[PDB]
Amino acid sequence: SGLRKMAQPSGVVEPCIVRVAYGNNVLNGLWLGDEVICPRHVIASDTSRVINYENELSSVRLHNFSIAKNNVFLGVVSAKYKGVNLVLKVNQVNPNTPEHKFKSVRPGESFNILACYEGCPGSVYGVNMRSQGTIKGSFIAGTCGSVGYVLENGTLYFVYMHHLELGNGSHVGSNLEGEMYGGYEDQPSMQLEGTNVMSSDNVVAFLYAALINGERWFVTNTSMTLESYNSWAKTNSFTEIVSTDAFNMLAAKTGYSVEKLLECIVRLNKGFGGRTILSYGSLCDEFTPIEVIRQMYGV
Amino acid sequence: SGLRKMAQPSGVVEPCIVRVAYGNNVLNGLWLGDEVICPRHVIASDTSRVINYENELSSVRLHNFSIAKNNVFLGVVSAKYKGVNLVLKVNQVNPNTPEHKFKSVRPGESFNILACYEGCPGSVYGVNMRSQGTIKGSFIAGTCGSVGYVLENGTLYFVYMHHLELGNGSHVGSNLEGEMYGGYEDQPSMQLEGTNVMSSDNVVAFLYAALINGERWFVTNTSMTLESYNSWAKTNSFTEIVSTDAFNMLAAKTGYSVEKLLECIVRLNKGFGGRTILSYGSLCDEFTPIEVIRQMYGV
Ligand SMILES: *[C@@H](O)[C@H](C[C@@H]1CCNC1=O)NC(=O)[C@H](CC(C)C)NC(=O)OCc1ccccc1
Ligand SMILES: *[C@@H](O)[C@H](C[C@@H]1CCNC1=O)NC(=O)[C@H](CC(C)C)NC(=O)OCc1ccccc1
């Protein structure tokens, strides 16, 4: 089997992607109702030097937007900022607007990326939000405005819109309220990412996935109290676990308690000593308990 | 940027997925026009024992079929085998039939999986055909009939439908004409997968991907002739590389010849020294050259 990232199906999102162009900039927007949301730097005169967003908005030429998807062309009625996004009122309502909500993801939470190029959906893949508000994706020029979404209990949530890449290659975006994850600015200046704190919950999930896949060299009958692991995590840039509850099913199927896997984390946090788990050379925190449960058992 | 296995968007496929139930079996089918294609073992009395497909077909009663797509009830008009698939003529035309073709994938080629459960699309992810005609596909019970597809040259091709899992965990399916990849039978019987042979072309692509992403610890200026590499590969379960032409753009952009990366391959197959390469602990052959070119540079 193995453990691989998957994405939820993208069909309900694709009809919402449009191409937004202004001046020499082209990126993607999200068309819902009679509004299109896109990163505000599309109206920046020059995206390599610092941008004065007040000047850009007050001087904006609504008729100088080009917004299109296939046989649809959209006129801009009015424009405003909401955080780091432009909210553009347009003169047509999207006939394929799905029921949807907006919410923010938190560190350790997984979601899907619909990566789009110049208004055209190209690829769909799963990611996971890190403590500093970055994701490791695969964005290149033309993919700003790409959208992250999650389906929960049949509800479509929009959670991410892509804005920029940091000097170290990490990817940064906003929620659909225009709040940038991790507090970064939509400027080219160059910005630092601090140290990410690993999701302990997701690492446990990972080890359970390994066990289900038959690998067991890393496990023993020694256990380490939550209560004690949390004291360690703390000072080792690992999150601390509130309860063992999310794992009860996975413990049942495997026969191994959480407390036994906490020992593994503390022994292996430096590395595998030339060994591997699900082909990775070190601990992976990009898979949630629910992600793993669903991939191994279809729940 | 980085290297993620990506899937092409699934929207054009999702309206084609239907639930197919018969006897004690529930799986997925592909509804195109007035036809539903699904694995023929859906009519098997007992899928845990050897199946006589002639007896099962003579015993079929069309009213025991239940086929559904949301609120649509698809009545079965007639049934026949085509290879290892059932082709069911149904009493309604799919109004969302996309323009499409059928084609077979070959070892080393990438394509997308839309994994479906009880007729409901669940996940989408990219895979790559292995030398023995298998994929590592994350399939579990209830996912038979899941579809593989690729969007290439402006057309949607259906290339895979899921049938079974081998004793070693590999997954086996057919093309949509009903020929099982790798010559496997649609029986619960035990079937052997020979040795997996890695696509050398895809491994070079992968290492170029690493170079483009700034990872360079494994490379040196020592090179190895194409002829020497193929002589090595013949006895080390790697394919032989016909010529270096497909990599010219990647060679130009990185400054490294294929012949240097060939030497790299021969050195890293003995082990990584506990190191990692785009986070993998061993060589990965799941990305084609054009897949890598397009993810890193677009167009
Ligand atoms: C989309 O407009 C674009 C996506 C970047 C480009 C390369 N990989 C990405 O994620 N965003 C920008 O170009 C962005 C706009 C600023 C005004 C915030 N600037 C940016 O990301 O610069 C950093 C960078 C540019 C090009 C390659 C590598 C890093
Ligand atoms: C879909 O009907 C199912 C998908 C299998 C189930 C487990 N993982 C998959 O991909 N296919 C079968 O159950 C198939 C039935 C025909 C061969 C008659 N048999 C099969 O795959 O048996 C091997 C196996 C069964 C259950 C768990 C693990 C391996």
Side-chain angles (χ1 to χ4, degrees), chain A residues 128-136 160 166 168 170-173 181-182 184 193 196:
Chain A
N128 185 274
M129 179 59 74
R130 277 107 63 89
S131 59
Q132 295 277 320
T134 58
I135 60 172
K136 299 255 211 195
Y160 181 94
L166 299 174
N168 73 353
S170 287
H171 294 120
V172 167
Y181 285 103
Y184 304 96
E193 177 178 31
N196 280 317

Side-chain angles (χ1 to χ4, degrees), chain B residues 263-283:
Chain B
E263 191 269 350
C264 288
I265 284 172
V266 179
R267 178 155 46 82
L268 290 45
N269 196 237
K270 294 339 165 267
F272 264 40
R275 304 274 264 145
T276 80
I277 298 137
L278 299 148
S279 88
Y280 306 63
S282 63
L283 291 169

Side-chain angles (χ1 to χ4, degrees), chain A residues 26-27 41 44 47-48 51 53 139-145 162-166 171 185-188:
Chain A
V26 180
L27 50 57
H41 71 261
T47 44
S48 69
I51 309 146
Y53 280 113
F139 303 101
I140 57 164
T143 68
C144 281
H162 192 53
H163 288 257
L164 62 91
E165 181 174 314
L166 299 174
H171 294 120
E185 292 183 18
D186 48 340
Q187 301 281 357

Side-chain angles (χ1 to χ4, degrees), chain A residues 103-118:
Chain A
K103 79 167 199 195
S104 315
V105 292
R106 284 129 92 151
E109 289 179 354
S110 287
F111 55 104
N112 319 286
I113 295 295
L114 184 61
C116 309
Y117 315 72
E118 299 218 353

Side-chain angles (χ1 to χ4, degrees), chain A residues 232 236 238 264-271 282-283:
Chain A
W232 171 90
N236 282 284
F238 267 78
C264 300
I265 296 174
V266 182
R267 295 180 244 125
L268 313 198
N269 68 116
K270 304 243 164 289
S282 70
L283 302 178

Side-chain angles (χ1 to χ4, degrees), chain A residues 20 34 54 222 238:
Chain A
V20 176
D34 58 15
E54 258 211 18
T222 27
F238 267 78

Side-chain angles (χ1 to χ4, degrees), chain B residues 212-231:
Chain B
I212 299 166
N213 206 61
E215 233 176 337
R216 294 192 159 79
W217 67 263
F218 53 84
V219 74
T220 89
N221 314 62
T222 308
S223 78
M224 170 166 211
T225 69
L226 176 53
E227 286 63 42
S228 282
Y229 175 80
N230 292 328
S231 285

Side-chain angles (χ1 to χ4, degrees), chain A residues 117-294:
Chain A
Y117 315 72
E118 299 218 353
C120 176
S123 100
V124 60
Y125 56 97
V127 296
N128 185 274
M129 179 59 74
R130 277 107 63 89
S131 59
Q132 295 277 320
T134 58
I135 60 172
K136 299 255 211 195
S138 161
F139 303 101
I140 57 164
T143 68
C144 281
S146 296
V147 160
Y149 60 99
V150 316
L151 292 313
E152 292 185 353
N153 292 343
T155 294
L156 174 54
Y157 294 84
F158 291 108
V159 310
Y160 181 94
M161 174 162 276
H162 192 53
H163 288 257
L164 62 91
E165 181 174 314
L166 299 174
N168 73 353
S170 287
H171 294 120
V172 167
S174 65
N175 59 25
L176 277 296
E177 322 293 353
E179 312 165 84
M180 208 48 109
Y181 285 103
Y184 304 96
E185 292 183 18
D186 48 340
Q187 301 281 357
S189 309
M190 74 132 279
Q191 308 173 79
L192 266 281
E193 177 178 31
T195 90
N196 280 317
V197 181
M198 299 260 289
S199 176
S200 296
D201 304 73
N202 297 352
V203 165
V204 175
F206 166 85
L207 296 175
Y208 272 123
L211 298 183
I212 305 191
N213 197 57
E215 330 184 39
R216 312 215 143 75
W217 64 254
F218 48 81
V219 70
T220 92
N221 213 59
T222 27
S223 97
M224 180 215 303
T225 279
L226 173 37
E227 193 225 356
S228 293
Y229 170 85
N230 273 350
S231 287
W232 171 90
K234 255 235 207 183
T235 70
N236 282 284
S237 297
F238 267 78
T239 64
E240 337 181 20
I241 283 141
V242 164
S243 83
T244 54
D245 287 338
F247 302 96
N248 281 351
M249 161 170 158
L250 286 165
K253 301 260 203 203
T254 56
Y256 290 126
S257 71
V258 176
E259 281 85 358
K260 284 145 150 87
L261 294 187
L262 300 185
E263 202 100 46
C264 300
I265 296 174
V266 182
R267 295 180 244 125
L268 313 198
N269 68 116
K270 304 243 164 289
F272 301 155
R275 284 193 200 131
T276 58
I277 302 110
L278 298 145
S279 91
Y280 288 99
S282 70
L283 302 178
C284 180
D285 88 329
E286 283 139 42
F287 296 88
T288 66
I290 306 172
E291 229 170 340
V292 170
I293 284 169
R294 292 180 167 154

